[PDB]
Amino acid sequence: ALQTIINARLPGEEGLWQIHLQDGKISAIDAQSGVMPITENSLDAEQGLVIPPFVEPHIHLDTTQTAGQPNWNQSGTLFEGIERWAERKALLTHDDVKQRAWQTLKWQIANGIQHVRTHVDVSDATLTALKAMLEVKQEVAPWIDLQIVAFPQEGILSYPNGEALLEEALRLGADVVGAIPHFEFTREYGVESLHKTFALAQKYDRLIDVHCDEIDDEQSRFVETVAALAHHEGMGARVTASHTTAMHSYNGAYTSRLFRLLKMSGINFVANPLVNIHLQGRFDTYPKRRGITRVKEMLESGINVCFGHDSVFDPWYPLGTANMLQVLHMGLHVCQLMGYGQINDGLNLITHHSARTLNLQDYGIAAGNSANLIILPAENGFDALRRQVPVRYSVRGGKVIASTQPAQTTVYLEQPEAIDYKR
Amino acid sequence: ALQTIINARLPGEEGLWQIHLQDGKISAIDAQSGVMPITENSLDAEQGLVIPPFVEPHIHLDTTQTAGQPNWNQSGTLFEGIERWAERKALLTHDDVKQRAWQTLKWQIANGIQHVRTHVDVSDATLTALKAMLEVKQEVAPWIDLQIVAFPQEGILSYPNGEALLEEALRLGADVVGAIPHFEFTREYGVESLHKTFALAQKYDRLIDVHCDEIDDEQSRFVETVAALAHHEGMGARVTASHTTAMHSYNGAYTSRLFRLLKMSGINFVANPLVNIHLQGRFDTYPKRRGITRVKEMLESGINVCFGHDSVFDPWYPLGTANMLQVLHMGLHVCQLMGYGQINDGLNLITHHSARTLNLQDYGIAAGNSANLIILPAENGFDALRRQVPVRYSVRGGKVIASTQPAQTTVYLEQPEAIDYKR
Ligand SMILES: O=C1NC=C(F)[C@H](O)N1
Ligand SMILES: O=C1NC=C(F)[C@H](O)N1
Ligand SMILES: [Fe+3]
Ligand SMILES: [Fe+3]
């Protein structure tokens, strides 16, 4: 078994490092003063970057791989997406869900993702997808720690037996309680649905992840209730507000007032760049707003924010290979986090910040932690992002679970020349 | 003791008037048909304007004279101001508060102000400033009738034990119940905080003065709850909505609907020109809104509105000499009340309208009232405002408590010439 990772670069650190492994855990981390020789039982990072695993804080594995079935989302909006999904949800089968979820999970394993939070639509009396996903969770455990959010896609108060079905999903084992206040029939149902969500999370000791204000409506302010209830219950670390795209349209004075509460509450935020740039701004003609939440300001204020892929070939997104560096690339551009340091520090948005969002207790390159880490063939975060590098090796429990032999490009000039796009 | 004020001009009246004094009160007011001779026991207004005392309806004496301690409000916003104040509040001492409050009160006495309403932050378990201010109130009584507002600066529902501390402040003697709905964590807490404020005011028979919608948020409409609760309880005269700067940003249709309720409710409004022009519009780039409430429209609709200084060298305002004519000057410009009559009638915004806001029962130049009046060396309100004249004499209980010997300016041309800036 592997005993050491050598010649590793670490974000924010100078030089090279050696990571000693023992019994599936990291036993010690020591700085090197030069390049170490390879040897049996040593995985050579070759001066590449070593980081804890990529994380997918927000994806829909029950809907993945279904775009165009039975119809396509023509308008490219959240609302038509839900209608198209409703048509597909009526055709679900146990095996159908497991096969599609596993297809995307394999792409995630290949992409160095070892932690995934999937929402599963529980606005369905049969709970077909949830039952299938609970089995997938057990099956994929050796490679990915999968969290399941009981997501009441059609509302808690606005769907028949919505609250009972949400609770049934928790009794069956869902890890996180979801909600979607802006989709409820009225603002009052939206606020009430959040009180019910928090009560269920406290009753069952579960996390919370709300699809919150995913709409270009400057009056959609459910995020303040999510943060206030979390603060009141002293449970911010266990709470996440996904999307908050309406915040892109708020006036600045209200946003400033709100930010004090967001920071005090300690709740987490997920932005989904690939899907948000596609679904938001659809009701504008020109100019057209970007529609991503206030990521730059959250980072400046010390509010935990991270990025999710959200959808992979489904009603809300026709593309994707479940690649977090690609999600990061889109977010940095749309949010204008284009300074050198902002880009270089971008990896935090798909690693550490996402681990905090999932309330992970065993994450990071530190002594005592499980030996879960990935190696990128790049010098730092900036380089990895610019070149959209693959994951050279993914290690879990001290064993290699995925590897990518890099592509080899040659140009035939006066003589052949290898091209690696580096400077 | 003084027996008469002679050669006095009165706002809205033609000619000169004599005000007879007896036992510290005004015994009679009689018109003169010409200039009266001076004599012992007669204070000669010298054809200057005689008015009841200036009033300061909104100031923070617990924070006065603390700008830059320990840090400056860099952004010039309400929100950073509260954060900077929090840092200073942690350093308060009894003597510190009394000394600074008295420094500003002396400037007010010098400026002919005999009625002052100070807010005091009670989001503090030690209630340090409140205890100090209650002593200052007794000490300054011979010169100024000071009202104290128990102001829960960090919220009633959003601060630990906020409601209990607010009530404790009333049990200790605060004259007015305050609130700050737009600073509460949620809109629901904002509305609920107002029900609690009104319940306390009725339980203790106290006045109400809410820091209401002091934010450039077109959705901040707490003023309608303040007015509706006042109307329901039949207590409009005892209620004040301070700031209402959000009203500057409301659409006109909602404002028109709202105005019917504002008039029916009978509540009072305070605008704070010097601070509002500084703190509002801070989230705009260009164009930049003024941010003062709808003073002109309130006056046209017969809704009582008046002006306060708000802050004198503190986290929210780096300037000031506690001068009401200066506050008035700024308000007339920013609110575009620049017609001759509007400027001339401007004195009402810092005298009679403010007295109504404080629910004063002994105010005005009328027989039977206490002999509390000031003399301005000017022909009318327009002249006093244009030349920013000092208070020549301030009389309280029939005795002179302040006087200003005017500056003397001379230009040396072919011959020396006195300049008084008059036409
Ligand atoms: O409500 C939603 N359902 C599915 C999505 F992909 C999007 O995150 N929002
Ligand atoms: O909430 C507030 N505190 C202090 C001020 F000066 C301003 O009136 N508003
Ligand atoms: Fe989603
Ligand atoms: Fe104030």
PDB file of C-alpha atoms and ligand atoms in Angstrom, chain B residues 58 60 63 78 82 151 153 180 182 211 214 243 272 275 279 310-311 314 316-317, ligand 2:
ATOM      1  CA  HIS B  58     -34.050  64.369  17.229  1.00  0.00           C
ATOM      2  CA  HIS B  60     -28.171  61.537  19.972  1.00  0.00           C
ATOM      3  CA  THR B  63     -22.973  59.546  20.965  1.00  0.00           C
ATOM      4  CA  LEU B  78     -25.873  54.161   8.553  1.00  0.00           C
ATOM      5  CA  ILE B  82     -23.771  51.506  13.921  1.00  0.00           C
ATOM      6  CA  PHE B 151     -33.704  53.621  21.517  1.00  0.00           C
ATOM      7  CA  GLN B 153     -30.241  50.666  18.329  1.00  0.00           C
ATOM      8  CA  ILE B 180     -35.750  50.490  14.428  1.00  0.00           C
ATOM      9  CA  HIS B 182     -35.585  48.213   9.144  1.00  0.00           C
ATOM     10  CA  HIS B 211     -36.246  55.319  13.604  1.00  0.00           C
ATOM     11  CA  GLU B 214     -33.946  54.943   7.401  1.00  0.00           C
ATOM     12  CA  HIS B 243     -36.379  59.664   9.036  1.00  0.00           C
ATOM     13  CA  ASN B 272     -32.833  65.108   9.522  1.00  0.00           C
ATOM     14  CA  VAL B 275     -27.399  63.552   8.229  1.00  0.00           C
ATOM     15  CA  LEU B 279     -25.889  58.874   4.743  1.00  0.00           C
ATOM     16  CA  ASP B 310     -29.676  64.115  14.544  1.00  0.00           C
ATOM     17  CA  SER B 311     -25.915  63.999  15.212  1.00  0.00           C
ATOM     18  CA  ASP B 314     -20.445  61.365  16.039  1.00  0.00           C
ATOM     19  CA  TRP B 316     -23.070  59.368  11.613  1.00  0.00           C
ATOM     20  CA  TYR B 317     -21.966  63.037  11.221  1.00  0.00           C
TER      21      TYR B 317
HETATM   22  O1  LIG C   2     -30.132  54.427  13.715  1.00  0.00           O
HETATM   23  C1  LIG C   2     -29.549  55.518  13.807  1.00  0.00           C
HETATM   24  N1  LIG C   2     -28.609  55.860  14.789  1.00  0.00           N
HETATM   25  C2  LIG C   2     -27.948  57.161  14.830  1.00  0.00           C
HETATM   26  C3  LIG C   2     -28.225  58.102  13.914  1.00  0.00           C
HETATM   27  F1  LIG C   2     -27.612  59.254  13.950  1.00  0.00           F
HETATM   28  C4  LIG C   2     -29.208  57.814  12.874  1.00  0.00           C
HETATM   29  O2  LIG C   2     -30.336  58.736  13.254  1.00  0.00           O
HETATM   30  N2  LIG C   2     -29.806  56.529  12.890  1.00  0.00           N
END
